[PDB]
Amino acid sequence: ELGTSNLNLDARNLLAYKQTEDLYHQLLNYPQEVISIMDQTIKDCMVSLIVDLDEIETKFYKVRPYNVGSCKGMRELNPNDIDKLINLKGLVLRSTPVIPDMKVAFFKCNVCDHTMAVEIDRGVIQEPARCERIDCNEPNSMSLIHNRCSFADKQVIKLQETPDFVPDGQTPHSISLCVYDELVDSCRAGDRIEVTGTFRSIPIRANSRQRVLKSLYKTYVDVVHVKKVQDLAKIREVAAREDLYSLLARSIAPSIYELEDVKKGILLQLFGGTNKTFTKGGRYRGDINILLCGDPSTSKSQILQYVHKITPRGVYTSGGLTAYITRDVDTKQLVLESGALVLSDGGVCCIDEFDKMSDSTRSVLHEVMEQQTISIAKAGIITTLNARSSILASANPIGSRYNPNLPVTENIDLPPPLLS
Amino acid sequence: ALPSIQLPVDYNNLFNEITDFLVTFKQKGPKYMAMLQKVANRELNSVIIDLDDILQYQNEKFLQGTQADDLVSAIQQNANHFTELFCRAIDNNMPLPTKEIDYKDDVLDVILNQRRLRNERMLTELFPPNLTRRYFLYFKPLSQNCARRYRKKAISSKPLSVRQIKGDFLGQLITVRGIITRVSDVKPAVEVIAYTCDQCGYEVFQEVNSRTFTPLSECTSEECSQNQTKGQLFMSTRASKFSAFQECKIQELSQQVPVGHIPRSLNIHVNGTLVRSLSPGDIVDVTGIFLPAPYTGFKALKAGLLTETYLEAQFVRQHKKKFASFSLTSDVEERVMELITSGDVYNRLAKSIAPEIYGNLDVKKALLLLLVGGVDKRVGDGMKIRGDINVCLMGDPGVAKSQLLKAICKISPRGVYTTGKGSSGVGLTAAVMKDPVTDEMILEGGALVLADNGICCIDEFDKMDESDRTAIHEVMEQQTISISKAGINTTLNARTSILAAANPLYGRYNPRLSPLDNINLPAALLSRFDILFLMLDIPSRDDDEKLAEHVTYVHMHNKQPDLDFTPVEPSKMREYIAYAKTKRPVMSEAVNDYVVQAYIRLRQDSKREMDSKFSFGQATPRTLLGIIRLSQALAKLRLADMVDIDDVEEALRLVRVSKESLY
Ligand SMILES: Nc1ncnc2c1ncn2[C@@H]1O[C@H](COP(=O)(O)OP(=O)(O)OP(=O)(O)O)[C@@H](O)[C@H]1O
Ligand SMILES: Nc1ncnc2c1ncn2[C@@H]1O[C@H](COP(=O)(O)OP(=O)(O)O)[C@@H](O)[C@H]1O
Ligand SMILES: [Mg+2]
Ligand SMILES: [Zn+2]
Ligand SMILES: [Zn+2]
Structure with a gap:
């Protein structure tokens, strides 16, 4: 009644019968012929069971043995x-x-x-x-x-x-x-x-x-x-509750103590905004980008690790992140390769050790956060690639501690426009 | 055509003597019939022959004046011919099976029965013996005490070096010694090739011993002896015979290399059941046959008389030492009973590690606590915790911290030693990068050297480049290494204890603040480490006197002097460390309040860390985590399946001793 052509076949249940184990051992010794004759047996079993015969003559038949041995x-x-x-x-x-x-x-x-x-x-x-x-x-x-x-x-x-x-x-x-x-x-x-x-x-x-x-x-x-x-009904039953917000927010970081507001912000960032493409003025960015800063005594990498696996799509990297043409290793040919940011389209891209970002790559971020599009002009290839991704990053202060009297800018050693 | 010469040898008497020895030998009855019977039952798959029995039998039968010659001499002078003679003799005198056989499994015998009932039924071909043999034939070299028994110089043995082998030893049986460096994989090798010619009655068989051959195309059956073939013939894999094959090369030891010379290499071919009896990186005593190898495989048409040489293995002594994975036995049980009766152990173990280096007791105590490991095997909700401890050694040059590190590397089985530069393959690349002769690009991606449950010993921790520094930041807190270059993502499960020694960038301690002086290392990496210890050279009389006295007394005796007083020995430590790790006590709840208030007072210390003059009293949860890990290690090294509060106090005292070195 399906029209499919496949027969999975386990060996243990095949071993369960006393006459079959003889055919079992003969199958281990002579796989090809045994499998072929089993397929022909199924081909005849077609007519032996249907007694439209038209779909039968068109389709082949095969088996998929498994669990034969250790x-x-x-x-x-x-x-x-x-x-x-x-x-x-x-x-x-x-x-x-x-x-x-x-x-x-x-x-x-x-x-x-x-x-x-x-x-x-x-x-x-x-x-x-x-x-x-x-x-x-x-x-x-x-x-x-x-x-x-x-x-x-x-x-x-x-x-x-x-x-x-x-x-x-x-x-x-x-x-x-x-x-x-x-x-x-x-x-x-x-x-x-x-x-x-x-x-x-x-x-x-x-x-x-x-x-x-x-x-x-x-x-x-x-x-x-x-x-x-059909589990969409279960969602609305959950979605109808009044305190869905707080439980949903606290449900993604079970091991993190307190820090409720940042959890809510990260959850809302995961939800994302709206993206529109009205033609009179061009598209508007709908992604949220959030930065984390503080001393390395907060387990802040754990949050990024949580969100990386929680999110549908996302690449977790650290301070090469974008497209660059490479020479093939096993074969001798040239292929266009896309970086981590390009693969995070629609998802969340997580970045660690943001202070140690070098300098050349930083400009690329300034290119992607303001237009959501990256272009490449190298080796005769000129093209543009879409990113449209959210960014979440963590950075450390300079020194054994972050001085509250000291303003944020110098301790995080990022340029004012990028952090702005 | 070919001139002839007269030689004293004649193989008929040798074959008769071989058969007489095999049948009549008395060492259960005769030994060789005892082997051959269980061979017949398809129980033994390889036959090993000893020439000591041959020598002693010939000598004891020499008491009656019938024997005229000896065999071991001709065995030493040439070997393969005697292998053929032995296989012929065995096949002539093969006993009948005394036990039942699972006869249905032998598919080759089924094919043979089919062929026989096909051809003999119509009135038959003598199958070559090699197609039927289930056994491998191996020789064993003699022992020197057996030679001492008699006057004759039946010596052999004498484990020559790689370069001690000349061109006069071709064809003999010789013994070599050295370290194995490379071992190839196991591949099937052809011995007899069987075809099938679309029902031509008998199916042609042929044998090849050379490393290359040519196939058949038309069979000699009468219906195909007709002008045209009765069906084309094809090679049949099932009916053909194969043997396990492997290739390895050996390198000379450093001790045997003459001054101003480069060590040489030697190839070894191994076949039969002896395959997979040796692993790279071990000292062995190999006995084999030194055979030539034609150069025509290169197909250069040059070297009209030059040919390559190789060795075929016969009997391998693994030698070296067995780790045995602390496998229990009566002797080790009474050894651990003696250890229990010893009472207090850790101090003796600390004293017994490196008596060459004087003093530094607490460093050795920390080494003890590093060798056992901290709390491990996870917690609820799957949260990651590691038993590995990260301790960094810091101090002036000339404090013999490198020597203590070398001693620790010697005393530990998983220790790996690294230092500043000298090669580029230490990290970030697997050892099999571009290794195979076919250049298959074999790799794993992001991995280190045996990082799974290894001990990474590093010297000059301020010397390596940014790549190794990035790798060691990535190995942090049992985090795996997931660096990719060509789509590879098979990460290595990095779970190792880090022990590294670094020197100050000034070469000496400083009166001004230490954290700014530091080691030119990131503060995050510094805070990652569990314990930081210092070795500051203090010019004084009462310590330099003792150090000089110990060093000069070591120099005078040319040994480890009796001045040392250690009841326990390196093998004993190696046993007891595995024993203590095996016990694995679990955590006791009641320490919770004590460690909480200890961390409260440590944060009270952090309330004073802005006073400066040393700023290592920072606030970090990793401090508490390391405290718990060290307490668990103290509970693990001895005691029952609980954790004692005294362990927590000892861990805190160790931390205090580590901190007070700043001054
Ligand atoms: N406590 C000690 N007991 C015995 N010998 C010692 C001691 N301290 C230093 N030495 C001697 O010093 C030498 C080892 O010091 P060495 O400089 O190699 O180690 P290090 O402190 O790791 O520094 P470096 O990087 O310069 O090697 C040896 O010759 C050793 O005999
Ligand atoms: N609130 C917390 N809950 C649990 N563990 C924590 C907490 N704060 C710190 N830690 C521990 O301290 C470490 C802090 O490291 P982190 O701040 O992530 O360093 P970095 O971000 O520089 O890698 C974590 O590995 C974690 O084990
Ligand atoms: Mg040193
Ligand atoms: Zn034929
Ligand atoms: Zn035509």
Whole structure:
């Protein structure tokens, strides 16, 4: 009734039955064939259960086994575990662009314009030595067409072991990954995922101009399943209370003693104002910016840490913050990279150690707080980027204490316009 | 073609003697049949051979005038040929299994049974032995007392240096000594390659021993001996055989390097179950086979006679020392019973750390309290608290604070020592930056050197640049390091105790105010530290006399003199520190009022900190937090699962002693 095509399959409940554990062990030894025949079984189960048959013929069927066994680590992988299903957990580091894969080779008998479609197996193509049209029957008239074939999408992921597996300060390792179709782009950098797939080894080409192969093989895994690691009525019931303001304000800093007014101000800053774009006079800024000052005996960084995770969007940094073009490390190419402030659009950008701001970056803030737009003119690229972000910063006085007789200006060593 | 020579050796008698030794040996019955039986049961996966048994057996059978030659000599002169002879002998005399086998698991044997029932049923090929062996063969070098037993010079051993190996030792069995520096990962290595030719009856097998090879394309089956092939053949991974492989290199020790020379290196190849039996940074005694390596892998066409050399491991003695993670045993239990009977411990431990440096008792007491750690394991609502203590040592040059720091680094297992400049890889970069030969850009991002539960010992804390200073501000209060350069965000869980020594920018104490003199350090960083202590050189007679007397008495005896009186020893301290950390007493509530009133009087002190002449009596909650941490450490170093008020008083007295050094 859904029209979906996916069948998750646990192993424990599969182990719960006494006849099935035989198929369980046979699946560990022979994953590919068992999975293929299970998919064909589901394909026939389509008709066995529906007895519209039209949606059935169009869709393929696959399974997603998981929880087959204990999660191993990259530090213990003996060659006894080749072509066997394993469960792995780790952190996704990098990715790669999707790589087309040859599936259906297209050919054309150029002299007689005759076209033939050829299937392939194990990558290697058995090219047709002669065009089937015995009327021409020429052997050498076989020419293929690159852009009229059919292709499969392949993506390669690089995976790092979790730091839990290195207790004595050693270095983690990397295991290459492969995915197909629905698993493409299912993960990206920085993710924490767990995967279940079979092992694999491949001969390395060595000299691409020669037939020799090295005595060692590269190790990589092929995975089939990946896991990671109307309430609006309730709002109005809460929103109808009279003391919502005070409880809501005090609810974001449970461990902070007193300091109620600053908490209320920070909460209102989090709520934000209104933004309008009337054309007769240009847009008006709707963001609130608040500064914190005082001796480093107030745990003021804790407030920024609270708001950073409380806010939907936000970047927490300290005194590089904006866009600058970089040279790619792993690849040799040029990409445009945006800084912390650009990513905080619509959210709250938190800044610490504001006094140690150097000098070049300060002007950038003067650029962004007065127009909410930053432009760049470098390496032939001229463009403007929108920021539209709120700012919350903390600074320290000069000396072991802040003298109340001393005015604020000198102790905070910021220019009068910026603080104004 | 090739001229011939006459050699005294003949392998037939050697093989017969090998078989006779294996069958007849008496050291349970015969030992070697005892090994081979459990090998048959698929219980033992590798066979290790000792030549001491061979030597003693040959000598004791020499009592009857039948033997004519000896084996260990030819073993020493050449090794691989004897490995083949031993594998042949083992396969000839392989016993039957005396136990049942989980026979369904051996997928290779399933493939073999399929092939046999395919070909023999139609009327069969002799499979090569290497495709069937489940066992690895290893040799062990002899012992020198066994050589002393007899007159002959059957010595070997003699752990040569890296540079002591010449070109005349190729092919022999030799022993090296040194420190392991690099260890590669584990990768599969091919031994036998099996193809399949689309149902060609027998499937072709071939073996390769060289580090490179070429594949097959057309099989020799009769249906493919026909003018065209019965289906193209492909390489089959499941049927082929593989062995665990790894590569490591060793470097000469400094002691063995002649003056005015640079240490050299030597590569080692390891195979079989012995893989992963050694880790970088340890002294080992490796016995192996010194084999040549062809240069054609470089493919330069030069070096017509020049070739590279390597060693193949056979038996590794890890040597060095085992940390053992304070694993309990009867001896350590009676040792801790002796420690309990010792009564008062901390003073003896302080006396026993660095007797070379005279005096400075309270510094050693603070070192004791730093080694145990403060209150940890969080509080309610998940709020972060660390047991690590940050103490900074301050004083004049020539006070041997660096030497005491070196002693602490020696006495602690997790200690890391750093000082002013000399290299750029100390911080902000992982040790694996651009390390692999493939240059895979292996990195973690923001991390330090073993910062997880490490002891960061720093000398010249006023010397490093802004980058290391930023790193050490970021390691503050168990905060992780999350510096990113290329999208990496795998932060290192920085939880370490900070102990650093810094010198005044004037090189001497000053009559004017100290906080302005300071260390040229941020006041925030200064307030972060839990304890600040001073070492001021006071010219006096009654102290310089004792110091000079102790130093000269140390010089005269060339040892640690009996002048020292320490009941406890460095290994004993290393045991007891782990023991005390294991106990981990919990906090007692009743100290709340006492510590609150103590902090009240400390804020009363802050009411007097504008009097100046020293302005370290500041107001900071971190002062109270460090007080609580030090009281918890005092409760942890001994006593039951409670916290004593005397611990709080001792912590306050320690703080007072730290403060009074200003004057
Ligand atoms: N209390 C002491 N007992 C024994 N030797 C001492 C003592 N104080 C200093 N020394 C001697 O002083 C030397 C160590 O002082 P050293 O200057 O290396 O340390 P430091 O105070 O950390 O300063 P620096 O940065 O100059 O090294 C050694 O030769 C040591 O014998
Ligand atoms: N009101 C408070 N409640 C809880 N802890 C506090 C409070 N005031 C100070 N502290 C403690 O003292 C420290 C003050 O540091 P902070 O003022 O944030 O330094 P900086 O802002 O310069 O990094 C905090 O780490 C916190 O543990
Ligand atoms: Mg020094
Ligand atoms: Zn044609
Ligand atoms: Zn064939």
